[model samples]
Target: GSSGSSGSRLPKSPPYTAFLGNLPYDVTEESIKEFFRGLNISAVRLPREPSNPERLKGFGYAEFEDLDSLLSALSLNEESLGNKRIRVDVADQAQDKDSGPSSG
Candidate 1:
């Protein structure tokens, strides 16, 4: 009898975010969304070509609903996105430093 499940929240990435690089330039938001299917993505960003103003710009960033979704997404590192093996990691842009009160 092993009982280690002592918390409601699993201790994972504090940011609950991901940096998806090396993405296929042709990949669409819906395309990558389906890859990380079954997980609820709270926010998604692909920047854009900047010049032409279109789809992805060879990279992506995703913010999941919580730790479970974010950490699970990390497990998908090096996973294929069309012809490219994308890189997934916690986005280093951790600028949000605020006290969030739990509202029920």
Candidate 2:
């Protein structure tokens, strides 16, 4: 009494990446990293406006060594940071046609 083909099912894996939004303007790289502490974070990038590199655009990106770490970070979504409730979610890996193939 078995079921249909389950062989095609994809493996469950963590996203390994996340996007942090609603960030306070004064948030720092170290602070963001700390927020995601306990995870094997590889990088944290808060892109700034081209016109003003000193100011962040209110969002950032984070990469992890594995999906489990990413999942752990996702659990912190809507958490408080510097009087602000930040949002965290899985980041898409879509590539921009203009940007060409990703080097990574």
Candidate 3:
């Protein structure tokens, strides 16, 4: 007599801390935030456009409060989503912030 219940379980891994690239010009910070919302991201940040002289660069950065959520997004890298093949990877601290002197 064999009556058993078995299930396969996946190991839990820390979420990803991701930065996205190849974003279309039309994408905005709010839009970026909203996109991650679908994946349960707690927070995100988009660099402010260079002020004094406005520029609409097609690329920006985003952060996730938890790595898991970030990993979820990262898993889809190079895959088509929202008409773009977004690249996701860990943000480089050296480039994440503006640490240069400003010419006023």
Candidate 4:
């Protein structure tokens, strides 16, 4: 480890979490992240079935770096990523329904 100024200073962003379902078995992490089209996206825990060692389960979770990215990210709903037409939905990391947003 290298020394740095305030390196231990903690910073945080709202989870801005989203859901990805019906992912093709062929879908890779790269494919999932790229599916957001270069947004500051982090695809976490694309889980697997108990039968296969690490075969990804049908669904996954992703997070946008900020609320802004998440806003546009929803447009990707019903978009095809692999052989399947992936469905995008919000995860309960942040709150509010049509009831949300920043001050204009």
Candidate 5:
């Protein structure tokens, strides 16, 4: 694992958060950032299962600076990437696990 400084800052109020689905399993952090090249992307989070950190859960989240940038990205829905048609949509704010999910 390595670190880079591209689009490091996360938005304070990310109303333009988007849920990106059906991504290629090989998708990288840099690839997600580059996909939204013209937008002021804040952060791209591709969560992986705890047991297998190297494998994605087949979806991800991306935050933009504003609605305009987010809306622009919506046009990319159904776009092809590595033999898969990615889906993009406005996603609700992620809920904190402590606030909802129960611990066994």
Candidate 6:
């Protein structure tokens, strides 16, 4: 789900403190950063596919300093940010590791 410096920092322990899902395609890094800014996201890794542009492959990782902020963002209106709706929730790492890599 991650690459480069972003991948190494993520802890392998249980109760992963990240969320994964299809975010609004039109959404920007700044917008997402701002949307969850109040919750204090330490870093958000939304990578764009080098081969394709103008399409959000529907997945990304978000890191928060605390679980409180991570949980709070999940309950908020993720759809209100852009023309598309986002499905935000806890990322199932067990399933993800087995499922293989995904886009966006």
Go through the candidates in order and give each one's C-alpha lDDT.
0.71, 0.75, 0.60, 0.68, 0.77, 0.63
- Model 2 per-residue lDDT tens digits across residues 27-85: 99899788988888888877889899988887788878866787787777867998888
Estimated TM-score for each candidate = 0.68, 0.73, 0.55, 0.67, 0.74, 0.60
lDDT of 6 by residue, 16-39 (tens): 456656567667778778777778
Q: How does candidate 1 score on lDDT?
A: 0.71
Please rank every candidate by lDDT, starting with the best: 5, 2, 1, 4, 6, 3
The C-alpha stretches of model 4 lying farther than 4 A from their native spots are 1-13, 94-104
lDDT score for residue 42 of model 6: 67
Candidate 6 root-mean-square deviation in Å: 12.1
Best by TM-score: 5
Model 3 misplaced stretches (Cα beyond 4 Å): 1-16, 40-42, 48-54, 94-104
Q: Which scores greater on TM-score, model 3 or model 5?
A: 5
lDDT of 5: 0.77
- Between candidates 2 and 4, the one scoring higher on TM-score is 2
Please report how far candidate 1 places residue 69 from its true position, in Å.
0.9
The better candidate by lDDT, 4 or 6, is 4
As a whole number from 0 to 100, the lDDT of residue 25 in candidate 5 is: 82
Worst 10 residues of 2 by lDDT: 6-15
